[PDB]
Amino acid sequence: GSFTPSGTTGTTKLTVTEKCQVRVGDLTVAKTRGQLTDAAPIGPVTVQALGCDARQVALKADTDNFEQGKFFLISDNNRDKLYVNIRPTDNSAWTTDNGVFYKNDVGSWGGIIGIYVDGQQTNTPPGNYTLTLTGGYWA
Amino acid sequence: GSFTPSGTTGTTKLTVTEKCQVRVGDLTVAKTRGQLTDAAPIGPVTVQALGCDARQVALKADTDNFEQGKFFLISDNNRDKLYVNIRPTDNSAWTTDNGVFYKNDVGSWGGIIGIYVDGQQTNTPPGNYTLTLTGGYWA
Amino acid sequence: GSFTPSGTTGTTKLTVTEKCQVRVGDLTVAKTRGQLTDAAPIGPVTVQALGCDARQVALKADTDNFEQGKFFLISDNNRDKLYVNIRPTDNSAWTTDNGVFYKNDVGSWGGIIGIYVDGQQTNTPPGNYTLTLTGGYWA
Ligand SMILES: O=C(O)CCC(=O)OC[C@@H](NC(=O)C(Cl)Cl)[C@H](O)c1ccc([N+](=O)[O-])cc1
Ligand SMILES: O=C(O)CCC(=O)OC[C@@H](NC(=O)C(Cl)Cl)[C@H](O)c1ccc([N+](=O)[O-])cc1
Ligand SMILES: O=C(O)CCC(=O)OC[C@@H](NC(=O)C(Cl)Cl)[C@H](O)c1ccc([N+](=O)[O-])cc1
């Protein structure tokens, strides 16, 4: 049961605002707190594995993005959490183990991992939220 | 008289150089210190508000970018200032209040905010300068 | 013998992985440690000088990227080095002096600087490696 970092990093960012929302500069992913309903999509994460025919593809969340079997985006100040579910768009089987989301079967998997709001969190404080996922393999 | 953060962040960057200027890597906004003449344009900042029919759109500068009713880009080391004026390209009326630039009338305004050199500053030390503006609303 | 910073910054990034490599998110430059063979190209660095007819174009590496006449990409944690050679793709003559790579002749040079693995380093620890180069001039 261990993760070996071996791959690149994907960063999922979301800015939460109030109903009166002021977008400054280039387009980024932003939602009102009212839009943070259960199962609301936050964004996709592409995964492309190579040379993993005999290993289980895995993604490890940054330390600040997990606790107690749960994943969450975290505010810039490290204070506020936005709980999420992480799920492949296909029908593949994965397991969660202490910040690690790994594939049940070996193979050089390619696919999309979706990040979804876990439980309505319409009271989330406005701010910039991040989830960082690093590629590697589990055993 | 208070700002509520509610929106995204726009970052205005400028690299100041000497006459002999060496651009490394991708194109970025760069000027010689000799080009930092009064009213010289540094760049535009897009603003798009939504759901603000009953609020005054506002932009708040990072703490390190204002003092004494004045705005400035700040060097990477926090030491050197480049004083600027912030002005909408249209004929709309705005007010400055302690790092906050807010619109006089309520409404979901969309427009361009220009950043301009305030007073000739042709002796500015070469370096990378930044101005950070966060969207929200004032009352 | 001194460098005057005057220009922009180019950042060369490389993620080193094991054979089982998991790419997460957008495409970035990544190699297996087995690919870090001698003279292996890491990437190009564009250089465009202006107003340097009477100066020697120069690039200075960040402090953490050089020591003892040698250049290296450095890991995120500052611990691990990946030694490189820096060489213009054309036939121009340059000199290295304590973290500074400068052109022997004056002139507003434009060209490509290649970054290459210096000596096989197939045991490099997986991680994210960076080399930062700032433009300016030498005398
Ligand atoms: O994406 C966001 O920024 C917010 C969520 C969204 O787009 O709503 C719905 C959306 N789904 C997702 O973002 C899920 Cl989280 Cl993967 C959409 O159906 C979609 C986008 C991208 C891809 N893809 O690249 O394969 C598949 C499906
Ligand atoms: O922009 C820079 O990088 C330097 C300033 C400049 O472009 O000089 C002149 C320029 N103006 C500005 O940058 C002002 Cl600061 Cl908005 C130009 O007229 C312009 C650019 C973009 C837009 N727009 O997007 O609507 C309107 C006008
Ligand atoms: O580049 C990488 O990401 C890895 C190295 C590579 O591309 O292998 C080979 C490659 N060379 C380089 O990257 C050297 Cl380090 Cl400049 C290629 O021949 C090339 C790329 C770009 C340019 N250019 O912009 O002028 C010239 C030549």
**Can you spell out the DSSP letters for A40-73?**
-EEEEEEEEEES-TTSEEEEEE-GGGEETTEEEE
- Cα distance between residue A47 and residue A49, in whole Å: 7
Residue A119: alpha-carbon gap to chain centroid? 15
Whether residues A23 and B134 touch (CB distance < 8 A) is answered with no
CA distances from A63 to A117, A131, B57, B77 (A): 19, 10, 36, 29
* Residues in chain A whose Cβ is within 8 Å of chain C: 4-11, 45-52, 54-55, 57-59, 108, 133-137
| Ligand 1 mean position, distance from CA A31 (Å) | 14
Cβ contact B114:B88 at 8 Å = yes
Q: Give how many domains chain C has, as a whole number.
A: 1
Name the amino acid, one letter, at B3: F
- Residue of B17, B26, B28 with shortest CB distance to C6: B17
Report chain A residues whose CB lies below 8 A from the CB of C128: 9
| Residues A9, C126: C-beta atoms closer than 8 Å | no
Which residues of C sit within 8 Å Cβ distance of A? 15, 17-26, 28, 30, 32, 126-128
Asked if B10 and A25 touch (Cβ cutoff 8 Å), the reply is yes
Cα torsion C48, C50, C53, C54: sign = negative
Contact B7 A26 (CB under 8 A): no
Dihedral sign, CA of A59, A62, A66, A67?
positive
CA B24 – CA C61 distance, rounded (Å): 12
Residue B139 distance to chain C (closest CA, Å):
40
Q: CA A13, CA B85: separation in Å to the nearest integer?
A: 31
CA distance B73 to B84: 7
Two tokens, residue C54: 């009477």
Catalogue the E-assigned strands of B3-139. Answer: 3-17, 21-24, 30-32, 41-50, 56-61, 66-67, 70-75, 81-88, 94-97, 100-103, 110-117, 127-138
Of B8, B49, B54, the CB nearest to A30: B8
- Give the residue, by CA position, lying nearest to ligand 3 atom 1: C43
SS3 C96: strand
Whether residue B117 contacts residue B36, with contact meaning beta carbons closer than 8 Å, is answered with yes
- For the CA atoms of C23, C25, C26, C32, the dihedral, rounded to the nearest 10 degrees, stands at -20
* Residue C17 half-sphere exposure toward CB, CA atoms < 13 A: 25
Give the technique used to solve this structure: X-ray
Q: Which chains touch A (3 or more CB pairs under 8 A)?
A: B, C
Helix (H, G, I), strand (E, B) or coil at B101: strand
Q: Which of B14, B18, B22, B27 is the best residue to mutate to test the C interface, defined by the most C CB atoms within 10 Å of its own CB?
A: B22
**Are the CB atoms for C6 and B30 separated by under 8 Å?**
no
Which residues are CB-contacts of B123 (< 8 A; sequence separation ≥ 6)?
Answer: B33
Residues B113, B88 contacting (CB under 8 angstroms): yes
Closest CA to ligand 3's atom 2: C43
CA B82 to each of CA A119, A126, B94, B129, B132: distance values in angstroms, whole numbers, following the listed order: 46, 30, 22, 8, 13
Q: Return d(Cα A120, Cα A83) in angstroms, integer.
A: 9
CA–CA separation, A98 vs C108, rounded Å?
Answer: 55
- Is the CB–ligand 3 distance for residue C29 below 6 Å? yes
Q: Which domain holds residue A137?
A: 1-139
A49 contact residues in C (CB cutoff 8 A)? 20-23
Q: What count of residues does chain A have?
A: 139
Residue B64, helix vs strand vs coil: helix
Per DSSP, the three-state class of A34 is helix
Q: What is the resolution of this structure in A?
A: 1.9
For A23, the closest of B5, B48, B54 (CB atoms) is B48
CATH code of the domain containing B11: 2.60.40.1570
